Design a protein around this ligand. Structure first.
Ligand SMILES: COc1ccc(S(=O)(=O)N2Cc3cc(C#N)ccc3N(Cc3cncn3C)C[C@H]2Cc2ccccc2)cc1
Ligand SMILES: [Ca+2]
Ligand SMILES: [Zn+2]
Lengths: 305, 324
């Protein structure tokens, strides 16, 4: 029944593959190969040579068909690809064939492609193939970073699988303020946004990773000094509420570094001890980080006039 | 949060004899026939894991050499299997195999070089084949293939470097293309690339190293990016990258070792992505290779760059300097 039938699957796939290759050697670049490969590529989208066969067929058919006949084939290809993506949304072959197809169309509908991306990202907000495809589409349609920035906000606040959305922001933000290291006002707004995230969900590692980047991405003004001090106290508050939360402990150390390495030396060293106890797998990392910070402190101490 | 829990009776000993029997017998079948499209890499995974275990002789050298020769196309590129299309992925795998066998001149090396050269773009990137898919995976395949042939000078290295570095991200990692999110497999390809091209000083080793060691979950296993399940093959992608950048000690070796051993199938031999799952040769290689990086006594030292026995690379004088 179950195991018995996949013998029949094999021999059909096998026979269909046989036919495709025989046809290909014969120079038979026609719709029969499209039909044969549709049957195989659905279950086996990583069979790259068959995607190549489809492209060779479509290229050949384009030569001996009317514009409207070629347009029909394209629309059928789009539908085929969408059905394939529903079954396996992470196959490199499928996404690339779609890219190849859209890149050669005279009048592509990019807004429709962006919507396909929105839909696939609703199902899996971490699908990097889809995010990469979206960027491709956004580039071709010349969609502005500001418009994509709005997209990332909705995704971040509506629910929590957010690493991919934060990553995208990290690439968009620099584009809005492109130097040949963010402006402080922009940084300050990002800090507020990410702080909201990791207090809403303190287990959300993506916000903590993105926050570490912001702590490097920009001498303290009174406002930045005050914001950072405020973050410090807020993380101590969280530390009381979630004493096993390692992300907040590490961020406390980093904040003190950002504030005044030498003034906070005592507290930094205490936090290292606590943090290693809470996150013993990272002990070797945390010792190397502490060693680095101590070396920096020695250098700061020696700069004293 | 997302993690596996290792049941109390998971294997906790290394079953090398079982794994060698498993690979020795592989492809004697649904899975096998359905994965013809990767055959050359499958052969690479099997041969390399066997060689790491000291059991290469049990595989069929002569049969594999004839197979490799028949998969080289007129363009110089090598396909996954006979009648499939040439690709950088299978070109690298083929060259890796011939290196293991000291049989590089079984194929036309000048044409392989010409093939690789031809796939570089103006921005320094590489396409996987004539159909133009761009991925830093293919930057790695290009330089690794050329390094093993002594022909790294055949490509535009500075441009290749520039492209890879343009794929570096806020978290210290690397993506497939510029603006693509970091993940462990990609990081391996780009750090491997940077090792081969002598550019490891451009990696933020403390930052990337941190992101990589944070892949280790309470189970001891490694995932490939934040918030995903662990998978034994990350014992390769993560550990190799950490070794390249001199930060292998930043993960817990004993807990990872116990996770990798728990992924073995004590009945069939082989390793699976996670304990109790069905094994495959891919996960068997990376389980064994990960254990070797951790210093497993019964397994040959492995190159973190090439994922081949170090003694093989020593023999051909191709041993990129690491961070330490
Ligand atoms: C099991 O269904 C599949 C799915 C995909 C593929 S694949 O596209 O050809 N390829 C090779 C691969 C080979 C085997 C084996 N034997 C098993 C898996 C696997 N994956 C998938 C995988 C591995 N860990 C988790 N996942 C989901 C990697 C993939 C991409 C890759 C190729 C070469 C080098 C590195 C990575 C093959 C089988
Ligand atoms: Ca033999
Ligand atoms: Zn895996």
């Amino acid at each position: 029944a179950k195991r018995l039938e996949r013998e029949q699957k094999l021999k059909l796939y096998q026979s269909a593959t046989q036919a495709v290759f025989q046809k290909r050697q014969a120079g038979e670049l026609d719709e029969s190969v499209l039909e044969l490969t549709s049957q195989i590529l659905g279950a086996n989208p990583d069979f790259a040579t068959l995607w190549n066969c489809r492209r060779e067929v479509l290229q050949h058919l384009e030569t001996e068909k009317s514009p409207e006949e070629s347009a029909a084939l394209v629309k059928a290809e789009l539908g085929f690809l969408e059905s394939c993506l529903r079954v396996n949304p992470k196959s490199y072959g499928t996404w690339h064939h779609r890219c190849w197809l859209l890149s050669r169309l005279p009048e592509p509908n990019w807004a429709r492609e962006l919507e396909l991306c929105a839909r696939f990202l609703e199902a899996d907000e971490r699908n990097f193939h889809c995010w990469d495809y979206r960027r491709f589409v956004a580039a071709q349609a010349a969609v502005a970073p500001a418009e994509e920035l709005a997209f990332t906000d909705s995704l971040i606040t509506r629910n929590f699988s957010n690493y991919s959305s934060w990553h995208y922001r990290s690439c968009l933000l620099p584009q809005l303020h492109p130097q040949p290291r963010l402006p402080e006002n922009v940084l300050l707004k990002e800090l507020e946004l990410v702080q909201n995230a990791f207090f809403t969900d303190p287990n959300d590692q993506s916000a903590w990773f993105y926050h570490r980047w912001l702590l490097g991405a920009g001498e303290l003004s009174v406002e930045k000094s005050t914001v950072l001090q405020s973050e410090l106290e807020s993380c101590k508050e969280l530390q009381e509420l979630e004493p096993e939360n390692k992300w907040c402990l590490l961020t406390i150390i980093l904040l003190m570094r950002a504030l005044d390495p030498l003034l906070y030396e005592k507290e930094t060293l205490q936090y290292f001890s606590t943090l290693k106890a809470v996150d013993p797998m990272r002990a070797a990392y945390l010792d190397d980080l502490r060693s680095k910070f101590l070396l920096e402190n020695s250098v700061l101490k020696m700069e004293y006039a | 949060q997302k993690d596996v829990t290792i049941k109390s009776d998971a294997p906790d000993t290394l079953l090398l004899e079982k794994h060698a029997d498993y690979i020795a017998s592989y492809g004697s079948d649904y899975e096998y026939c359905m994965s013809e499209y990767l055959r050359m890499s499958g052969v690479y995974w099997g041969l390399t894991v066997m060689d790491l275990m000291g059991q290469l002789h049990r595989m069929n050298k002569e049969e594999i050499l004839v197979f490799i020769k028949s998969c080289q196309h007129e363009c110089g590129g090598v396909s996954a299997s006979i009648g499939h299309d040439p690709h950088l992925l299978y070109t690298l795998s083929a060259v890796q195999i011939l290196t293991l066998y000291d049989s590089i001149h079984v194929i036309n090396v000048d044409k392989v070089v010409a093939y690789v050269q031809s796939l570089q773009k103006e921005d320094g990137s590489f396409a996987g084949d004539i159909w133009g898919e761009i991925d830093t995976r293919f930057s790695f395949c290009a330089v690794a293939t050329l390094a093993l042939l002594g022909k790294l000078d055949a490509i535009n290295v500075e441009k290749a470097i520039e492209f890879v570095l343009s794929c570096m991200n806020f978290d210290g990692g690397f993506g497939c293309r510029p603006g693509s999110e970091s993940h462990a497999g990609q990081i391996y390809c780009c750090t491997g690339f940077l090792a081969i091209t002598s550019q490891l000083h451009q990696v933020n080793s403390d930052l990337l190293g941190w992101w990589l060691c944070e892949r280790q979950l309470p189970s001891g296993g490694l995932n490939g990016r934040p918030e995903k399940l662990p998978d034994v093959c990350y014992s390769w992608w993560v550990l190799a990258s950490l070794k390249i950048i001199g930060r292998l000690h930043w993960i817990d070796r004993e807990k990872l070792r116990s996770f990798i051993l728990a992924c073995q199938d004590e009945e069939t031999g082989g390793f699976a992505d996670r304990p109790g799952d069905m094994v495959d040769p891919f996960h068997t290689l990376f389980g064994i290779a990960g254990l070797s990086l951790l210093g497993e006594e019964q397994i040959k030292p492995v190159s973190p760059v090439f994922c081949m026995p170090e003694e093989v690379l020593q023999r051909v004088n191709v041993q990129p300097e690491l961070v330490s």
